[PDB]
Amino acid sequence: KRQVASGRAYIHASYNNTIVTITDPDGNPITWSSGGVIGYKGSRKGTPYAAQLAALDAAKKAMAYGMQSVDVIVRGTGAGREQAIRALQASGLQVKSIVDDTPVPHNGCRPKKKF
Amino acid sequence: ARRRRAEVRQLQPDLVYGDVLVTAFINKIMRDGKKNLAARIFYDACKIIQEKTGQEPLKVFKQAVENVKPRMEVRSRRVGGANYQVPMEVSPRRQQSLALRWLVQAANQRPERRAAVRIAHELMDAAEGKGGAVKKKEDVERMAEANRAYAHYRW
Amino acid sequence: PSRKAKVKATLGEFDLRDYRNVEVLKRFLSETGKILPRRRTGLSGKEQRILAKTIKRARILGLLPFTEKLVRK
RNA sequence: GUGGGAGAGGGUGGUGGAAUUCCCGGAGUAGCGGUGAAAUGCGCAGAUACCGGGAGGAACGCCGAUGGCGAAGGCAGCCACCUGGUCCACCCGUGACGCUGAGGCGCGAAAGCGUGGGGAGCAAACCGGAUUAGAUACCCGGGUAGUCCACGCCCUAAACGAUGCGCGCUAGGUCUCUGGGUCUCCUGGGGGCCGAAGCUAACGCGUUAAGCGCGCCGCCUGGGGAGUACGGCCGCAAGG
Structure with missing residues (x-):
């Protein structure tokens, strides 16, 4: 118990694994859940189900801190970005607003072989 | 079937009860x-x-x-x-088909000697939610949401 | 379709070179901080070419953004 | 000559934000990352995801086009300075002063060479991981030269429109950048597509000619052997 109502929920999606981190209003993470932490270990994490789980068990750990309100922040394009959000929208948390602030360079580091 | 859906064979009801399910x-x-x-x-x-x-x-x-x-x-x-x-998600046609087929494939596996009996008993333990006709059911569905990890393709 | 309403049609006489007029420019930026394409601005080959340079200026004088975040998704 | 215009044309100095890596702090756990799968690797000296702070190099989203500029190679964040080309209008001035152009001189992508600086990302070679009958590869994780900067050299190329320069002449339609006009239309320069006559082995070309013609340079003359051999010239070398 630490009683921290209303916080932020960063959702970091990939083409290899989706994760979630729940931070406090200030920006400090309270509890974070990935995909490889649930049980799955490889090709499995990219799945929308993998993300679903990752999202849900990540809220269950927040309800423990009395988390009620949350602003959702999505990072990137993964496989099941959606399902992660739709997850929190049913986990029992009040969803303020969904934010998309995926990091696009304005042409900087020369990307590697696979663009 | 390649050109059409192929019309389904309509059967003659029973002489006794009259239900075509029979x-x-x-x-x-x-x-x-x-x-x-x-x-x-x-x-x-x-x-x-x-x-x-x-x-x-x-x-x-x-x-x-x-x-x-x-x-x-x-x-x-x-x-x-x-x-x-x-x-x-399974269709009405296939459901009906699968049920009967399992009711019999399981039936004939019973340790009982007479066939009329073997069937009779499967129809009872069925309703009560047991036996093996219903086990081949729960075994299937136990594969459904088992790999529901993949429900994101066709349909 | 993109046949919503161009920003030139719904606007008045305004100087393309006054890079300080934020109240207007903002009309030329997207829901993000990007520069609207000609299909959306309603402008011409020459106009857009200028409006381009002008925004990149007001950006510099911390007036207009370089990129926003999104409200839905 | 005078008055307009457009442009990523070049040079120098500067400066803006995104992202990346690294460093520090905060908070926080058990994984992260990567693949068709996987492993190599990174994490309890606590990674990942998240916030804040700092350093540094590279590059410059959107606008951006089937667009513009340039002799070509090539050129795009913003600003200022220095500078080349060019187009239009007026028809003012010179009075044929013009075209071409062996050798020459200059420019010349990428890689590569010297000395010095710099090094974030990427990445020959090289080190491991997996794949396979095998893999000195295609895939994954690292990684040195190099790639960025200066001065100097190298000078090649599918350096391509694979189409030398310059002038005149020969239906149009349409889209587009740009200038003048009496501007629902005329008129100049440029970029595209379709297409008359004509040409073409055909494909195609077609007022951006591969058409009808004149000038001048360059080059070809069976394939392989060879862009080799010899010789000379060049270069630090690689080589040309």
Whole structure:
């Protein structure tokens, strides 16, 4: 118990694994859940189900801190970005607003072989 | 089937009860087209239900079927050079088909000697939610949401 | 379709070179901080070419953004 | 000559924000990352995801086009300075002063060479991981030269429109950048597509000619052997 109502929920999606981190209003993470932490270990994490789980068990750990309100922040394009959000929208948390602030360079580091 | 959906064969109701669901069931018992025998099996198998159960076998039959129709199944699919099991919602046609077929495939596995009996008993333990006709049901669905990790393809 | 309403049609006489007029420019930026394409601005080959340079200026004087975040998704 | 215009044309100095890596702090756990799968690797000296702070190099989203500029190679964040080309209008001034152009001189992508600086990302070679009958590969994780900067050299190329420069002449339609006009239309320069006559082995070309013609340079003359051999010239070398 630490009683921290209303916080932020960063959702970091990939083409290899989706994760979630729940931070406090200030920006400090309270509890974070990935995909490889649930049980799955490889090709499995990219799945929308993998993300679903990752999202849900990540809220269950927040309800423990009395988390009620949350602003959702999505990072990137993964496989099941959606399902992660739709997850929190049913986990029992009040969803303020969904934010998309995926990091696009304005042409900087020369990307590697696979663009 | 390549050009059309192919019309489904309409059957003749039963001479006794009159439910076509009956006709379907027997057909499934019938081997080597001995439909005169297959009929007796069902009948005497109903008589066993009256003597051992205080209910009308017609209704009993139905509740049994009703209870085995699995509502979820798997369908193999080569997605990216691999066998991914893809759960999917089952149609009314297939349900009916699967039920009867399992009611009989399980039935004949019973440790009982007489065939009319073996069927009679499967129709009872069925309704009560047990036996093996219903086990081959829960075993299927136990694969449905088992790999519901993959429900994101076709349909 | 993109046949919503161009920003030139719903606007008045305004100087393309006054890079300080934020109240207007903002009309030329997307829901993000990006520069609207000609299909959306309603402008011409020459106009857009200028409006381009002008925004990159007001950006510099911390007036107009370089990129926003999104409200839905 | 005078008055307009457009442009990623070049040079120098400067400066803006995104992202990346690294460093520090905060908070926080058990994984992260990567693949068709996987492993190599990174994490309890606490990684990942998240916030804040700092350093540094590279590059410059959107606008951006089937667009513009340039002799070509090639050129795009913003600003200022220095500078080349060019187009239009007026028809003012010179009075044929013009075209071409062996050798020459200059420019010349990428890689590569010297000395010095710099090094974030990427990445020959090289080190491991997996794949396979095998893999000195295609895939994954690292990684040195190099790639960025200066001065100097190298000078090649599918350096391509694979189409030398310059002038005149020969239906149009349409889209587009740009200038003048009496501007629902005329008129100049440029970029595209379709297409008359004509040409073409055909494909195609077609007022951006591969058409009808004149000038001048360059080059070809069976394939392989060879862009080799010899010789000379060049270069630090690689080589040309």
